[PDB]
Ligand binder design. Structure first.
Ligand SMILES: CC(C)CCC[C@@H](C)[C@H]1CC[C@H]2[C@@H]3CC=C4C[C@@H](OC(=O)CCC(=O)O)CC[C@]4(C)[C@H]3CC[C@]12C
Ligand SMILES: N[C@@H](Cc1cc(I)c(Oc2cc(I)c(O)c(I)c2)c(I)c1)C(=O)O
Length: 546
């Protein structure tokens, strides 16, 4: 009936917003390159969405509750689509991309800001509506379906990003027969704008069903303004709601931190390429998370689980997920031998901080750059920071490979390009890591829908959307924003070799200490998870008491 139609429309809106998010994440680097803006303005573009979302989420979730919720959702979709289309606008006004053979970025800012605004009503009003009119058993399953869509959607955004990056930026504007560069060329820019047009159109189409959906299923603003403060105290005077908010905030501090640096952990700890890390996370781990969320919804529906049972399932999923995550401490690889950083040039195992001599006797004759990181794998099994630092004098191109010779440090003499592959059982450790991380992701996500149901049922019904708004504001502000920052700071304390930008400032870290990285990355996650587990126990105790 009308409830099923609303569920389908909300699922399509979730898909549209997720696809836009994925495409934006895939193309932000191309946008930075095309517009010739510094990384600070790139972070500003990425953060305009969040400014827009956080500034109006509370107002929308509170006042929109008594209004026509389907129509507010449709208006939000329209604003989302307009903002998405605004990002592609500068393509139609800037000059042709000239490659070696400026103020239009504000639009990219403004459009993203509109996206942040247009997303705000979708979750608080959409879920509350779903919870108001579905039967008690079916609500959890419907919410699970919607959240599964939200989890899976960005993969399509990244696929569209790749497809549009395969096309030239000035396609349709310029004859392509006069262009001598290929996607492999570093000067190539893809059709970044095309995906924004597609996503904006999809978002505008997503708004259409919400103008035919009813407000309810089987002066006032000034009066809501007066009751705003009493309603806030009602939500935060509620102990189950407040403690579940704290529990979720701490658990998401753990989870955002773990997820953000999981690709880098895979690449650094297990010697995998960035592409392989992204493939295993996006194509294996994310489906496991989606399956966990959906199965939590299924379990809530099938066994008619109550609020107390939902709290128990949330606690159990957290407990067993973090216990499984503990086993990752034993799946560790040792540091690869890097001359001067992890080992000395004589092949002696780990020197200390006070012994990091990028220059040695075997490379004193050569004037090599310290800041440059062009690692090569020598025949001796020791990785060197650069071929110059090994005294390599001749280089020959054999097929797709480049081989150095007469490398004095190696002979204490050939070397190929890249880091030496990790040999002693590290691929097996990485396979175990993959299996355990997939299982852990599924197990942790198995409690996602139960906690959501706990939040929705612990409060008086008329506050649902408002509570959902506040929850969303909390997770974003107290977990989503801060956790990547301080996780990054603590992890970067394990850096052995800093990359340097053209201005002399530090760039991305090139070599980490594997043991310190593993300890920090896993321990911070587990400690936050343990705090969350204790808070969840408190939530369960109060639920039993009341
Ligand atoms: C927490 C934040 C900071 C990052 C969240 C990680 C994931 C949600 C995202 C980030 C990078 C994304 C991946 C990077 C790009 C790709 C390639 C993309 O297209 C391809 O398969 C490559 C095509 C080609 O070979 O050219 C498929 C999805 C995937 C794995 C993405 C899936 C979703 C990922 C893992
Ligand atoms: N920009 C996105 C980034 C993001 C996506 C997912 I999906 C996610 O959820 C999980 C949970 C577990 I457990 C995992 O192992 C993995 I991988 C992802 C988290 I946290 C963050 C967002 O913030 O929504």
């Amino acid at each position: 009936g009308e409830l099923k139609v609303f569920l389908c429309a909300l699922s399509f809106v979730y898909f549209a917003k997720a696809l836009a998010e994925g495409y934006l994440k895939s193309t932000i680097t191309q946008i930075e390159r095309r517009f010739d803006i510094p990384s600070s303005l790139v972070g500003v573009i990425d953060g305009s969405f969040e400014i827009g979302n956080l500034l109006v989420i509370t107002f929308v979730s509170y006042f929109g509750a008594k209004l026509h919720r389907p129509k507010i959702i449709g208006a939000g979709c329209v604003i989302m689509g307009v903002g998405t289309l605004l990002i592609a606008m500068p393509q139609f006004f800037m000059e042709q991309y000239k490659y070696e053979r400026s103020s239009m970025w504000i639009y990219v800012f403004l459009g993203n800001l509109l996206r942040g605004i247009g997303e705000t009503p979708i979750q608080p009003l959409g879920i509350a509506y779903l919870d108001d009119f579905a039967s008690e058993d079916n609500a959890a399953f419907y919410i699970g379906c919607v959240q599964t869509v939200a989890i899976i959607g960005p993969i399509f955004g990244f696929l569209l990003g790749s497809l549009c990056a395969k096309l030239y930026v000035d396609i349709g504007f310029v004859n392509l027969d006069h262009i001598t560069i290929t996607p492999k060329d570093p000067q190539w820019v893809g059709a970044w704008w095309l995906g924004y047009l597609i996503a904006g159109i999809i978002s505008l189409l997503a708004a259409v069903p919400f103008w035919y959906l009813p407000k309810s299923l089987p002066a006032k603003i000034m009066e809501m303004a007066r009751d705003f403060l009493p309603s806030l105290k009602n939500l935060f005077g509620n102990p189950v709601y407040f403690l579940y908010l704290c529990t979720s905030t701490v658990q998401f501090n753990s989870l955002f931190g773990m997820v953000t640096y999981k690709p880098k952990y895979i690449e650094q700890q297990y010697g995998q390429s960035s592409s392989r890390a992204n493939f295993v996370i996006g194509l294996i781990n994310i489906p496991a998370v989606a399956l966990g969320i959906f199965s939590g919804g299924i379990v809530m529906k099938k066994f008619r689980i109550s609020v107390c049972g939902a709290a128990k399932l949330y606690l159990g999923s957290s407990v067993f997920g973090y216990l499984l995550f503990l086993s990752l401490f034993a799946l560790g690889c040792e540091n690869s031998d890097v001359a001067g950083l992890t080992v000395s040039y004589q092949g002696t195992k780990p020197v200390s901080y006070h012994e990091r001599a990028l220059f040695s006797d075997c490379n004193s004759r050569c004037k090599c750059s310290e800041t440059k990181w062009e690692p090569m794998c020598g025949e001796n099994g020791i990785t060197y920071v650069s071929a110059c630092l090994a005294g390599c004098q001749t280089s020959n191109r054999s097929g797709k490979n480049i081989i150095f010779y007469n490398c004095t440090c190696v002979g204490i003499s050939s070397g190929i390009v890249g880091r030496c592959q990790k040999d002693n059982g590290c691929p097996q450790m990485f396979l175990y890591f993959l299996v355990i991380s997939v299982i852990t992701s599924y197990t942790l996500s198995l409690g996602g829908i139960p906690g959501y149901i706990l939040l929705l049922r612990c409060i008086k019904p008329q506050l649902k959307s408002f509570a959902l708004g506040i929850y969303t504001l909390a997770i974003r502000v107290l977990a989503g924003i801060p956790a990547p920052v301080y996780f990054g700071v603590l992890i970067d304390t394990s850096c052995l070799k800093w990359g340097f930008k053209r201005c002399g400032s530090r760039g991305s870290c090139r070599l980490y200490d594997s043991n310190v990285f593993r300890h920090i990355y896993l321990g911070l996650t587990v400690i936050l998870g343990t705090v969350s587990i204790l808070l969840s126990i408190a939530v369960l105790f109060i639920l039993k008491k009341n």
